[PDB]
Symmetry: C3
Subunit: 332 residues, 3 copies
């Protein structure tokens, strides 16, 4: 059974076919690819774009999305095997995925890490469990990676440069400030897709403590080798932005401080100057800027940057709708 858990699992030809189908759906939004079909959107965390885009996408293709929120409207789910369920969990994922599999044709899942132990969060237990027990295709709506965002981001870049080939472009994935420590998912996905696209990638962050999990650094290295791009970690803002064609900002908490955020709070607080402003964007090569949203203005990016004609964040957000429809159509 084929799922969409990570782009890294898909071949380039498959990914390209997805992006092309996405571009096609953007031209002809109404279709019958999901006529009489349905998808269960299981959210363990908040969402505005994801929930809206998937719901509308199912509708535009003649299908129906059922939005569920365990612990809110649906019952809380257990994921550990062989444990004695006497805690807050009412039922086990083995039952949930099998039942849903009798109702819907597709299952989307969103589950952020708990932020207490990266060792456990990095295992992607929720997503894997759904993929393991579900008799129907599973779609990652963001767990520790965000493959749907990668494709929306990629398509938006191809549309901006007027070509499917982004090789050679200088891509800067930069960390930015935020009062609280966030999921690395989007950062991990950006690194993954930018290198898979064969761009010259620079991971710009404050200190080595903010470097992404080895898993994704390794995925990127393997991708660079296969696509002809390049990977590089930098802590110097000015040299990073220099001549950049793309600047993708995202904030995340240092992995080494998982479950121990108190001491890392004073650490990030002294780097809020990583905020993407006009000055830093001025060093780029008339580069485009984007963020996955939700973004806090004057914290992650200044108002000027967000309103500049070079910010393609809205286009990228719109593309979430088109690429997800391509993914559902492919899996169905």
């Amino acid at each position: 059974l084929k799922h969409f858990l990570n782009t890294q699992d898909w071949s380039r030809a498959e990914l390209d076919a997805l992006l092309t189908q996405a571009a096609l759906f953007k031209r002809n939004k109404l279709g019958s690819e999901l006529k009489g079909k349905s998808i269960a959107l299981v959210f363990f965390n908040p969402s505005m774009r994801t929930r809206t885009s998937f719901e509308l996408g199912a509708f535009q293709l003649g299908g129906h999305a059922v939005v569920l929120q365990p612990g809110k409207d649906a019952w809380p789910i257990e994921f550990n095997l062989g444990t004695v369920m006497d805690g807050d969990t009412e039922e086990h994922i083995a039952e949930v995925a099998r039942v849903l599999g009798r109702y819907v044709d597709l299952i989307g899942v969103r589950a952020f890490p708990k932020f207490v132990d990266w060792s456990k969060d990095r295992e992607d237990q929720v997503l894997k469990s759904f993929a393991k027990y579900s008799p129907v295709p599973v779609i990652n709506m963001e767990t520790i990676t965000h493959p749907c965002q990668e494709l929306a981001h990629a398509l938006a870049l191809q549309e901006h440069f007027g070509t499917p080939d982004l090789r050679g472009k200088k891509y800067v994935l930069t960390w930015t400030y935020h009062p609280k420590p966030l999921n690395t998912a989007v950062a991990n996905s950006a690194l993954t897709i930018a290198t898979r696209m064969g761009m010259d990638v620079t991971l710009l962050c404050p200190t080595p403590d903010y470097i992404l999990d080895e898993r994704y650094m390794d995925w990127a290295a393997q991708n660079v080798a296969e696509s002809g791009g390049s990977l590089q970690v930098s802590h110097d803002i000015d040299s990073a932005y220099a001549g950049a064609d793309v600047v993708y900002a995202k904030s995340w908490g240092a992995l080494p401080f998982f479950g121990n955020w108190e001491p890392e709070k004073p650490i990030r607080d002294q780097y809020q100057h990583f905020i993407v402003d006009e000055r830093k964007m001025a060093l780029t090569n008339n580069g485009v800027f984007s963020h996955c949203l939700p973004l806090r203005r004057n914290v992650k990016a200044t108002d000027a940057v967000m309103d500049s004609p070079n910010c393609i964040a809205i286009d990228e957000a719109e593309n979430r709708l088109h690429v997800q429809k391509a993914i559902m159509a492919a899996l169905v």
Copy 2:
């Protein structure tokens, strides 16, 4: 771009066309005016009728409504300009409205005042922000006015009297008791639509402290002058109800006590006799009674009044569905 923020913004011919389209939809509920289209219903406060009527209306016209609840399922939104977003707000309305504008064809918004500072609440910031940044038509699902309710109310009155012309009718908008201070929205809208319809309007309330914001008193005066009706503020129950053709009850907190409700609590508590009972309705001219709902029985109106054949509250509530479909069809 044309929005439906307040009936006061629309011409009489436009309003009449809306009410007639509403009456038409009531006869033929299924249509294709919204085929393949969608509306984002953004609720910042609870709702039963509004959410249900809009959702079904979109469905009956071949479209789809996506229900969102910032702070609940969607991310909390910021509205102030140029501020440093380091508080509870994750993203700015500028982004939210622009993103939604890439997904849906219409945006409905419901946001009650915060009840801390009327000076700020009366600015209708949420609604205006959506209308400002949204590339698609915005619909007021109740903020400080409730235009959708005005039309449902108006249509129900025209159907009751068997005519579109309500000029000459004596209309009594009366305050009623409630343990807590409420939004003036419905009261403001009633005053607005009743005068726009050219009726002889009497705003019956306990003391001058309960008179509506000048903005709406002025809208009503201008409406009276243009339609040939009349406006009047009264604090005497018996003289108000006398010979009335319509009695519309609603409770609201005194504007002068915004952000300082403690001292106004003992003030309303001594006027719970404003409750619409058989006695007061007996003074009317076989007048009809209505309320926007949700209504607390034996507090705002007695059981007898609510069950009398003269209560048209259910009909008015049903009409929310029909007029809103007319509004969406017109804006699309």
Copy 3:
């Protein structure tokens, strides 16, 4: 007006027609029985299967379900008559049911007992109120009985034995452990449907304190007399399971301890050995096992039992979709 509040209210011929229509819908899932129609699913308690199955069922039949959650998204409702609504309740069921009746064609309701006074919970006030004031058919989505579950359960049994006639089969409805006291609804429904099907039923529970309310014991006795089966209460595990063809587990709090759960906590804690494991299932006559879900593994049933080919819980859960579509089609 015909509602679906309990199977006990329906004749055998009607019930059989429902199960047959259900089997038919399972073969041809898409239809037009609810084209342009809608159902309001009012949930006062959590749900995953019920909400999903009804929502999809409405969609597959060309209709639309509107999901509501009083106190969450919709306004809190009052049910007592003639009371002064100055509490947490904003509106009365008389208004709610009448309004909904102007919007939707069907009303589903889910409302578990409050667990403070069985004398009040057993009156089924919410369900009855909706059925009383609603101008359109009402469907029990589980209150103190769960008729939709009975039919899903019944159909699954008929499919398992390859016949509509389950007379003669030995049916064991057994109590099982759970850290907290639960609703007896499913247990009451199982007893009701198993006897209505004319099986030899044994209610296996720890002590006489766990025997179901007389109402359902009496329904079962009347059913046994009419169908030719048999009813029996047992407290001995081994003799109960012996030669059983069906084993339906469910946990519930002792009725005599309603509103006084502290002393019954230590009572159930000494019977967690009622958990359906391989040993007990080994005594059966190659009997099938099922549970309504959500089920806690290793608490209500061991992992081995849940994964055995004799567990038909997933099939039964799937059938919720098919029988509910038959019910809606019949009531519409």
